[PDB]
Amino acid sequence: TKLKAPAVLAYSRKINPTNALMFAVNWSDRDNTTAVMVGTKTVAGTQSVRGNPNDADKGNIQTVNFANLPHNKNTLLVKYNVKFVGDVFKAELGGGEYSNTLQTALENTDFGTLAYRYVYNIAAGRTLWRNRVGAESIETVITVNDQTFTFSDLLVNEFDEDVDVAEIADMVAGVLSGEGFVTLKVEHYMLLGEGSEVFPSQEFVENSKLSKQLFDLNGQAAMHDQKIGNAIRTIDTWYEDATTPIAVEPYGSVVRNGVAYRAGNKTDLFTLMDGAVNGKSLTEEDQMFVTANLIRGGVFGG
Template identity: 40%
Template sequence: MAKNDKLKTASVLSFNRHLDPSDGRMFALNWVDLAQGTGNTAIVIQEKSVRGTISNRPKSSKEIDPAYIDAAVNKANLQTVDVAALPQGKDTVAVSFTLRVLPNVGQPSACNDVAFAERLDTVVSNYQSANQFTELANRYAVNLANGRFLWRNRIGAENVTVSVERTINGQAKEKLTFDALNNRLNQAIVHQDQQTELQKLAAWIKAGLNGDEHVLLKVTGFARLGEGQEVYPSQELILDTSNAKGAKSKTLYSFGNKEAGLHSQKIGNALRTIDTWYPNADKPIAVEPYGSVTSEGKAYRQPKEKQDFYSLFDAWVNEGKVPEVEQQHYVMAVLVRGGVFGESDK
């Protein structure tokens, strides 16, 4: 097929993810025992019942009446919530997970159009030959080294260390250690004192994405918070939104025996927070088709500006319009993320 022959995106088109983290297990230990790796204690989620006070914004003139406010304050606002905290005698939280780095980026798990699949294979092969996923590997490595996957558990910590072990045949063969607080969350580079370790970590990820080697990493982040301090597992999305009296208002994610944990999706979001190629970028955001940041209620990659994934991807594959190299990195990062991207044939 000639390069300028325009195609239509396959109606069935999906990709598996190629950075595949497990759920993160959370446990407690003392910072002084970190080097020995001893004294680990599971962090157990517990329920707490509290009496809250009125704090919502008034909705009508009636609700700003002093008598109404006084009456509302006197009503008990009872809540049951899940909480997780370091036990007394332990000052450090750890989050541990494994990460598989998988090859064949850009190869669809499902595609119902042979011509489109062939053109896509050519586009991905050309990108891989020119770039070898080097830029993406470097940025993923940064997000491991800076401990972004710890999320709120990283904020305000006195010390934060990340260890990454390369596992081969079930055995840890090599271990890298990073001082996460030396590595800023709003930059895509690592502190100069850790460049050697970063380059090695990026090389592992690159080898996995290119299919040169099987890559399985065990990642553990340690944050020194203080004895008894609250820690932050993932919060469960409760689909039953009924306001039944006595219903729990916050449910935290746990493993079978109530041990605190982080969702693999939350860890994956942290690892792919590498997009600094969107218009007027001032910070990394997670790689998403529309550059969506739900906590801000904003999409940074608008279709109107032709900077979203679908506009760039369709123009590149269907029309042969090669985007700037930065946007090529972005499109490939979305394919690493995986998803369903078919175009309706209706």
């Protein structure tokens, strides 16, 4: 008949990115790392809503948090650590016959191209979300277990094949397919131009004076760890009218566009599991989607 997820089936994080930090460096010298800090400036713009055409002559004012490269340096440095953990399938919470029948039905996935797309997203620098634009050249350096690599140009929308991402893909694919962890200490260098604007992650502010407050650790501009871990997993290219590599979620849902790319057409992850536990043959490019959501996380309820 049917096997169902346990009322409780929770899947812990198999990626642990640290919240990235934003530093200011020069281009020719990268050792004088000086914190880009969150400063609080004030804007005096316009009252311009789609509604309320009467209020179009009275200027609004709010205090926003801004972060720029200081006017002696022309490179933004983004420093983080990402821990790719193994023990992918073992259900943290939950875990009986919907964790083990998934193991006997999901041991033959493609971990290699999975790890290739994840290390490509770090290497092509899609982890910045706004600092790519207005940048002449990007240099992303990755250090794993006392070895260092440098990446100059990778067009991010099409996952090209090269030789300096592929061996890190072998390490990460070996560390998800078994036990353990692999630590990527990654530094992104962007020649944004002299004294340009950097874009940290905004925090939620619940009824505060600041209309725009950036993420802050010790007075200094920083980006959210879950924003980094969002941008590791923008690998999903197996949905209806496959196009952009969007972030992988059980409904294929980007909340900026307000449309879920895998929902309501029998393609979602949840659906793509009950057949797997029931024993149907999962194809080569959607069990990899299921495994990418295993290494994402989430709750798998009743």
